[PDB]
Design a protein around this motif. Structure first.
Motif, PDB file in Angstrom:
ATOM      1  N   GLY A  11       0.655  -1.166   0.036  1.00  0.00           N
ATOM      2  CA  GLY A  11      -0.218   0.101  -0.047  1.00  0.00           C
ATOM      3  C   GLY A  11       0.788   1.479  -0.002  1.00  0.00           C
ATOM      4  N   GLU A  12       0.009   2.498   0.031  1.00  0.00           N
ATOM      5  CA  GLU A  12       0.853   3.639   0.395  1.00  0.00           C
ATOM      6  C   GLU A  12       1.004   4.065   1.709  1.00  0.00           C
ATOM      7  N   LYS A  33      10.166  -0.416   1.564  1.00  0.00           N
ATOM      8  CA  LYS A  33       9.738   0.948   1.657  1.00  0.00           C
ATOM      9  C   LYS A  33      10.597   2.079   0.932  1.00  0.00           C
ATOM     10  N   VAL A  60       9.526  -4.038  14.853  1.00  0.00           N
ATOM     11  CA  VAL A  60       9.740  -4.611  13.453  1.00  0.00           C
ATOM     12  C   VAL A  60      11.231  -4.310  12.964  1.00  0.00           C
ATOM     13  N   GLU A  77      11.361  -6.251   8.372  1.00  0.00           N
ATOM     14  CA  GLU A  77      11.037  -7.666   8.400  1.00  0.00           C
ATOM     15  C   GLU A  77       9.646  -7.709   8.096  1.00  0.00           C
ATOM     16  N   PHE A  78       9.355  -8.698   7.382  1.00  0.00           N
ATOM     17  CA  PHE A  78       7.793  -8.915   6.880  1.00  0.00           C
ATOM     18  C   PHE A  78       7.046  -9.590   7.981  1.00  0.00           C
ATOM     19  N   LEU A  79       5.754  -9.074   8.061  1.00  0.00           N
ATOM     20  CA  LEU A  79       4.752  -9.842   9.114  1.00  0.00           C
ATOM     21  C   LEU A  79       3.514  -9.704   8.096  1.00  0.00           C
ATOM     22  N   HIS A  80       2.819 -10.757   8.438  1.00  0.00           N
ATOM     23  CA  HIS A  80       1.745 -10.915   7.396  1.00  0.00           C
ATOM     24  C   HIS A  80       0.410 -10.321   7.544  1.00  0.00           C
ATOM     25  N   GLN A  81       0.036  -9.520   8.754  1.00  0.00           N
ATOM     26  CA  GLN A  81      -0.975  -8.983   8.782  1.00  0.00           C
ATOM     27  C   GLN A  81      -0.835  -7.570   9.824  1.00  0.00           C
ATOM     28  N   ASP A  82      -1.566  -6.478   9.738  1.00  0.00           N
ATOM     29  CA  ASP A  82      -1.607  -5.445  10.610  1.00  0.00           C
ATOM     30  C   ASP A  82      -2.853  -5.436  11.582  1.00  0.00           C
ATOM     31  N   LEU A 130       1.909  -4.884  13.977  1.00  0.00           N
ATOM     32  CA  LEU A 130       2.004  -5.810  12.976  1.00  0.00           C
ATOM     33  C   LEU A 130       1.950  -7.416  13.833  1.00  0.00           C
TER      34      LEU A 130
HETATM   35  C1  LIG Z   1       0.911   0.680   3.214  1.00  0.00           C
HETATM   36  O1  LIG Z   1       0.355   0.792   4.610  1.00  0.00           O
HETATM   37  C2  LIG Z   1      -0.882   0.043   5.011  1.00  0.00           C
HETATM   38  C3  LIG Z   1      -1.036  -0.636   6.336  1.00  0.00           C
HETATM   39  C4  LIG Z   1      -0.088  -1.973   6.287  1.00  0.00           C
HETATM   40  N1  LIG Z   1       1.441  -1.543   6.237  1.00  0.00           N
HETATM   41  C5  LIG Z   1       2.354  -2.345   6.365  1.00  0.00           C
HETATM   42  C6  LIG Z   1       2.075  -3.728   6.652  1.00  0.00           C
HETATM   43  C7  LIG Z   1       3.257  -4.757   6.963  1.00  0.00           C
HETATM   44  N2  LIG Z   1       2.782  -6.069   7.406  1.00  0.00           N
HETATM   45  C8  LIG Z   1       1.399  -6.478   7.519  1.00  0.00           C
HETATM   46  C9  LIG Z   1       0.647  -6.539   6.190  1.00  0.00           C
HETATM   47  C10 LIG Z   1      -0.505  -6.041   5.780  1.00  0.00           C
HETATM   48  C11 LIG Z   1      -1.358  -6.255   4.646  1.00  0.00           C
HETATM   49  C12 LIG Z   1      -0.578  -7.261   3.557  1.00  0.00           C
HETATM   50  N3  LIG Z   1       0.578  -7.638   3.795  1.00  0.00           N
HETATM   51  C13 LIG Z   1       1.374  -7.485   5.074  1.00  0.00           C
HETATM   52  C14 LIG Z   1       4.635  -4.347   6.747  1.00  0.00           C
HETATM   53  C15 LIG Z   1       5.403  -5.175   7.185  1.00  0.00           C
HETATM   54  N4  LIG Z   1       6.557  -4.877   7.613  1.00  0.00           N
HETATM   55  O2  LIG Z   1       5.493  -6.390   7.010  1.00  0.00           O
HETATM   56  C16 LIG Z   1       4.883  -2.979   6.520  1.00  0.00           C
HETATM   57  C17 LIG Z   1       3.880  -2.040   6.319  1.00  0.00           C
HETATM   58  N5  LIG Z   1       4.100  -0.889   5.925  1.00  0.00           N
HETATM   59  O3  LIG Z   1       5.370  -0.512   5.706  1.00  0.00           O
HETATM   60  O4  LIG Z   1       3.301   0.242   5.566  1.00  0.00           O
END
Ligand SMILES: COCCCNc1cc(NCc2cccnc2)c(C(N)=O)cc1[N+](=O)[O-]
Length: 294
Positions: A11-12, A33, A60, A77-82, A130
């Motif tokens: 996303g943005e 990013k 993170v 580091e990557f996590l799958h959900q916020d 996250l």
């Molecule tokens: C663009 O922002 C929108 C808010 C979510 N924004 C983010 C969500 C993350 N992970 C959870 C996730 C959520 C959805 C899909 N896939 C992974 C991560 C990360 N570091 O793993 C980074 C950002 N971010 O750097 O923004």
């Protein structure tokens, strides 16, 4: 890119586009990013670089700061959900209290760690907390506000949320303390419990007045020095404080006592992360695993 294969657009963000990407040499899956004008301020580079050593299980991890072609990329580091998405997904029956407590406990540990190293977040919100399938929750973007500042709008013009902004910030204080993050976390805690934002303001004054309507208009008794703040106006309406029993039902008294301390007006009276970790609310904390469908 070059060393990173783009998997999907996350996303943005507040500073630029974020992609889920794969390191072609290691195979590592990360969050990439791209940071937004001309030359990349050296000060920001040195500051952000310091963050590479701010390592904690509930923070993170900043894997790399790439400054090439006079561009700025941050690899995380990557996590799958916020948490924002997880909350919307749990709106039906709500996040179980044990999981809310576990998450709050872990978030406070992360804040305690960063704060002990004198690093503030300043813009905590559900979108940057996250989670993974193991029941862990981590704070994203600590330290970026200090390095880049916090915009009114993102690069795509989205309005940056004011819902979690501490009152001292809204009143114009130029010096932020660690208390600003405790406030934001208290707001997030209340939202997990009620499944509704606590103070969903849509302008700085609406945000401030929403806080005043719930916690009462601050005065010199509860907040010494408030009438001298840059944006304080004697013409602010004087609202009486409401009862927490009505603010976050049906949270028990341990939960309400802790929240009340995280939302004290005076930053100096607001509970610290370390002291919050010792609050009786956490006597029975556990680490449940969330129901995550990826
Ligand atoms: C663009 O922002 C929108 C808010 C979510 N924004 C983010 C969500 C993350 N992970 C959870 C996730 C959520 C959805 C899909 N896939 C992974 C991560 C990360 N570091 O793993 C980074 C950002 N971010 O750097 O923004």
């Amino acid at each position: 890119m070059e060393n990173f294969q783009k998997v999907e657009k996350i996303g943005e963000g507040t500073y630029g586009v974020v992609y889920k990407a794969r390191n072609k040499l290691t195979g590592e899956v990360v969050a990439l990013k791209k940071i937004r004008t001309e030359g990349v301020p050296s000060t920001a580079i040195r500051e952000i670089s310091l963050l590479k050593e701010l390592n904690h299980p509930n923070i993170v991890k900043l894997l790399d700061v790439i400054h090439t072609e006079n561009k700025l990329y941050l690899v995380f580091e990557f996590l799958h959900q916020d948490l924002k998405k997880f909350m919307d997904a749990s709106a039906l029956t709500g996040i179980p209290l044990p999981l809310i407590k576990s998450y709050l406990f872990q978030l406070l540990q992360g804040l305690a760690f960063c704060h002990s190293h004198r690093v503030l977040h300043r813009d905590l919100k559900p979108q940057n907390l996250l989670i993974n399938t193991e029941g862990a929750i981590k704070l994203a973007d600590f330290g970026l506000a200090r390095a880049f500042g916090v915009p009114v709008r993102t690069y795509t013009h989205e309005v940056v949320t004011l819902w979690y902004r501490a009152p001292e910030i809204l009143l114009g204080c130029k010096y932020y303390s660690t208390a600003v993050d405790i406030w934001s976390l208290g707001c997030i805690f209340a939202e997990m419990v009620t499944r509704r934002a606590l103070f969903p303001g849509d302008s700085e004054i609406d945000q401030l007045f929403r806080i005043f309507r719930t916690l009462g208009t601050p005065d010199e008794v509860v907040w010494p020095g408030v009438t001298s703040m840059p944006d304080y106006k004697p013409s602010f309406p004087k609202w009486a404080r409401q009862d927490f029993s009505k603010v976050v039902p049906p949270l028990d008294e341990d939960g309400r006592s802790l929240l009340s301390q995280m939302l004290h007006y005076d930053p100096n009276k607001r509970i610290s992360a370390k002291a919050a970790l010792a609050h009786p609310f956490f006597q029975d904390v556990t680490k449940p695993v969330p129901h995550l469908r990826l």
